[PDB]
């Protein structure tokens, strides 16, 4: 069938949207935009199209293995309060006159509401359950063409608390137990890299590609996700929860009517909703079952898989390059039989470093001992767009991609220097900052990022050099296109911040030393940090980064 319908009502903002910054610094006003529902029509007509999928025995016999694996799980319901304590303090407000904020404190009116959806997803299994379809603003560098607004679609913030009751603890169970060690979120960056490194050596003849499915969301059929549901069954469940679980597939997840802001009718929906709990997990796992049926169709000779939603990776024995070539074509087309047809057909690749998959490529640099350290990179164009566009304005995204590439270049030189200096001119250093990735939100204190940094990444993040020629020309040019200061003066700026920091003393001055040792002649010796051995970040590892609007907080384990 087709993805979606639409019935020409437009997709419509609820807040004033900017697609240029104001020449209200306007250094980069001409170098950077932001996407906004002006161009929601655009990306409504690439996302939209038919469906035709026809599955054989790989499939069949993948999907009996999954079953039989999620059989050995079993889950709960979450209470009303912890599924509360889980969403975002900022998640879109109710349409039944309460926020985030009055879920979050248990208020009268959430919790009375919440109870009445979920007793109504207890008694009627049918009837459509409405959706919101709205354009996303996000920011890029002006290069061909301006990119399309991305579309989100979700229900209300009460049907959401119910999707955690009914499934958080699935999430946070059942990929793991299906996938093993294919299951990509359960890795730290460092461990990522361990993981690639590990699949590529025990190959006698290495051969790697990644695949990528165009518009994944719009290809997932109600078949995709009807058996998604009877995976979630495999797994011994409580009754309330096994009932909750049918009725939110057959009156949400299958499909339904999609609303503007407005509250026009907009459309309806065949496929995955973007903004539902179950959108990251149901990914991964129905990428995982096609991909692995695709090896088996077409030859993949002992494959190793790494899955982060429809990102998707393939490590096995190469055949020799016409038959690797070969098994490709015949991988391509067992995917797209499956109604998963690439975005750009799979390439074989012979270096693990020429792999690119979640817009990261695996990059070489050295260590404390002249010791080779191996770490994911990406072009940092759009992070840098976005620290741009976010310092003329208000404010994020600097701090997500702090984490999650802090032995980069661009971020130890860049990053780090510009937003530490921001924080401190600011004065608001020593507080926990809410920042906003793939639908789920994070709680960091920036004096905490040593720590963490360390558990994410090991020390080694504090102490690499002599980066590739690659990745300092990938980095001189997205500086030199954005017109922003090149490399050599990052260093002169980062010593003033890394004074600042040291002069402040207790965590600011562990900040200065640990995140800014590259930048001063006489080198510390830096040291494991304790804090980062107490460090509980246990909800990081799972789907939950991917999606689900679930809150993600920094923990303190006791030893
Ligand atoms: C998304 C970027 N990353 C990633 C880089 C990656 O590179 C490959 C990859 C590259 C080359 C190759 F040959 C094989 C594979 C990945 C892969 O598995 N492909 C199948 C992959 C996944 C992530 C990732 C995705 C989603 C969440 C998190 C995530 O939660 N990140 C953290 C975080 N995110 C926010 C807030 C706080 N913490 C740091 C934990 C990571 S990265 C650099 O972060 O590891």
């Given at each position: 069938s087709m993805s979606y319908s639409w019935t020409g009502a437009l997709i419509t903002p609820c807040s004033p949207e900017e697609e240029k910054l104001p020449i209200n610094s306007l250094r980069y006003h001409n170098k950077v935009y932001c996407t906004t529902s002006k161009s929601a029509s655009q990306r409504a007509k690439k996302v939209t199209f038919d469906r035709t999928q026809v599955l054989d025995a790989h499939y069949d016999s993948v999907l009996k293995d999954i079953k039989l694996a999620a059989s050995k799980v079993s889950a709960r319901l979450l209470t009303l309060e912890e599924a509360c304590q889980l969403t975002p303090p900022h998640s879109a407000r109710s349409?039944?006159?309460?926020?985030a904020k009055e879920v979050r404190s248990l208020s009268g009116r959430a919790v009375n509401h919440i109870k009445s959806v979920w007793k109504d997803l207890l008694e009627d299994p049918q009837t459509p359950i409405p959706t919101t379809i709205m354009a996303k603003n996000e920011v890029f560098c002006v290069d061909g063409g301006k990119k399309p607004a991305r579309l989100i679609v979700y229900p209300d913030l009460g049907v959401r608390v119910c999707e955690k009751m009914a499934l958080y603890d699935i999430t946070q169970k059942l990929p793991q137990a299906v996938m093993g060690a294919s299951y990509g979120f359960q890795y730290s960056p460092a461990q990522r890299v361990e993981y690639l490194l590990k699949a590529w050596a025990e190959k006698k003849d290495p051969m790697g590609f990644s695949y990528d499915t165009r518009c994944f969301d719009s290809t997932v059929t109600e078949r995709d996700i009807r058996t998604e549901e009877s995976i979630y069954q495999a797994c011994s469940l409580p009754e309330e929860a096994r009932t909750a679980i049918h009725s939110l597939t057959e009156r949400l997840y299958v499909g339904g009517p999609m609303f503007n802001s407005k509250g026009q009718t907009c459309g309806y929906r065949r496929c995955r909703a973007s903004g539902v709990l179950t959108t990251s997990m149901g990914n991964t796992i129905t990428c995982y079952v096609k991909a692995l049926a695709a090896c088996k169709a077409a030859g993949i000779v002992a494959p190793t898989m790494l899955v982060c939603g429809d990102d998707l990776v393939v490590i096995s024995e190469s055949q020799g390059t016409e038959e690797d070539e070969r098994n490709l074509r015949a991988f391509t087309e067992a995917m797209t039989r499956y109604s998963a047809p690439p975005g750009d057909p799979p390439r074989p690749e012979y270096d693990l470093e020429l792999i690119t998959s979640c817009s990261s490529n695996v990059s070489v640099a050295l260590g404390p001992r002249g010791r080779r350290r191996y770490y994911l990179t990406r072009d940092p164009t759009t992070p840098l767009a976005r620290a741009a566009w976010e310092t003329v304005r208000h404010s994020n995204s600097w701090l997500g991609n702090i984490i999650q590439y802090a032995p980069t270049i661009w971020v130890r030189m860049v990053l780090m220097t510009h937003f530490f200096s921001i924080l401190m001119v600011q004065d608001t250093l020593d507080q926990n900052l809410n920042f906003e990735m793939y639908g789920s939100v994070y709680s960091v204190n920036p004096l905490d990022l040593p720590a963490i940094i360390e558990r994410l990444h090991g020390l080694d993040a504090f102490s690499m050099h002599t980066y590739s020629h690659h990745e300092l020309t990938r980095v001189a040019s997205a500086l030199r296109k954005l017109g922003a200061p090149p490399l050599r003066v990052w260093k002169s700026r980062a010593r003033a911040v890394r004074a600042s920091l040291i002069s402040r003393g207790g965590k600011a001055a562990v900040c200065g030393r640990y995140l800014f040792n590259w930048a001063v002649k006489t080198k510390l010796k830096l040291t494991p940090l304790p804090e980062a051995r107490l460090?509980?970040?246990?909800?990081?590892?799972?789907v939950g980064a991917g999606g689900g609007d679930i809150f993600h907080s920094v923990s303190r384990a006791r030893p």
């Amino acid at each position: 069938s087709m993805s979606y319908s639409w019935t020409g009502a437009l997709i419509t903002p609820c807040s004033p949207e900017e697609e240029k910054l104001p020449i209200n610094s306007l250094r980069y006003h001409n170098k950077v935009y932001c996407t906004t529902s002006k161009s929601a029509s655009q990306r409504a007509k690439k996302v939209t199209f038919d469906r035709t999928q026809v599955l054989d025995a790989h499939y069949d016999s993948v999907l009996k293995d999954i079953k039989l694996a999620a059989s050995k799980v079993s889950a709960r319901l979450l209470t009303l309060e912890e599924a509360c304590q889980l969403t975002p303090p900022h998640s879109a407000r109710s349409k039944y006159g309460f926020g985030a904020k009055e879920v979050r404190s248990l208020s009268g009116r959430a919790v009375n509401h919440i109870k009445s959806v979920w007793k109504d997803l207890l008694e009627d299994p049918q009837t459509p359950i409405p959706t919101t379809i709205m354009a996303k603003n996000e920011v890029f560098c002006v290069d061909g063409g301006k990119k399309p607004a991305r579309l989100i679609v979700y229900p209300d913030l009460g049907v959401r608390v119910c999707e955690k009751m009914a499934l958080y603890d699935i999430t946070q169970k059942l990929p793991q137990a299906v996938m093993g060690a294919s299951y990509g979120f359960q890795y730290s960056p460092a461990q990522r890299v361990e993981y690639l490194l590990k699949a590529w050596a025990e190959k006698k003849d290495p051969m790697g590609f990644s695949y990528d499915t165009r518009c994944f969301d719009s290809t997932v059929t109600e078949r995709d996700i009807r058996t998604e549901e009877s995976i979630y069954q495999a797994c011994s469940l409580p009754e309330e929860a096994r009932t909750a679980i049918h009725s939110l597939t057959e009156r949400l997840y299958v499909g339904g009517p999609m609303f503007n802001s407005k509250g026009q009718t907009c459309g309806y929906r065949r496929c995955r909703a973007s903004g539902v709990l179950t959108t990251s997990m149901g990914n991964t796992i129905t990428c995982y079952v096609k991909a692995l049926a695709a090896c088996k169709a077409a030859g993949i000779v002992a494959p190793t898989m790494l899955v982060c939603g429809d990102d998707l990776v393939v490590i096995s024995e190469s055949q020799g390059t016409e038959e690797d070539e070969r098994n490709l074509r015949a991988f391509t087309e067992a995917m797209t039989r499956y109604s998963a047809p690439p975005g750009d057909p799979p390439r074989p690749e012979y270096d693990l470093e020429l792999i690119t998959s979640c817009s990261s490529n695996v990059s070489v640099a050295l260590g404390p001992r002249g010791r080779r350290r191996y770490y994911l990179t990406r072009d940092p164009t759009t992070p840098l767009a976005r620290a741009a566009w976010e310092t003329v304005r208000h404010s994020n995204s600097w701090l997500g991609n702090i984490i999650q590439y802090a032995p980069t270049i661009w971020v130890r030189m860049v990053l780090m220097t510009h937003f530490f200096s921001i924080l401190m001119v600011q004065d608001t250093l020593d507080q926990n900052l809410n920042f906003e990735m793939y639908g789920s939100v994070y709680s960091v204190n920036p004096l905490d990022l040593p720590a963490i940094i360390e558990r994410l990444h090991g020390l080694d993040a504090f102490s690499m050099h002599t980066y590739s020629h690659h990745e300092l020309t990938r980095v001189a040019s997205a500086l030199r296109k954005l017109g922003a200061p090149p490399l050599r003066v990052w260093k002169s700026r980062a010593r003033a911040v890394r004074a600042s920091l040291i002069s402040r003393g207790g965590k600011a001055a562990v900040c200065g030393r640990y995140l800014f040792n590259w930048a001063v002649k006489t080198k510390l010796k830096l040291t494991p940090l304790p804090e980062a051995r107490l460090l509980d970040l246990s909800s990081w590892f799972t789907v939950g980064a991917g999606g689900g609007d679930i809150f993600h907080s920094v923990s303190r384990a006791r030893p």
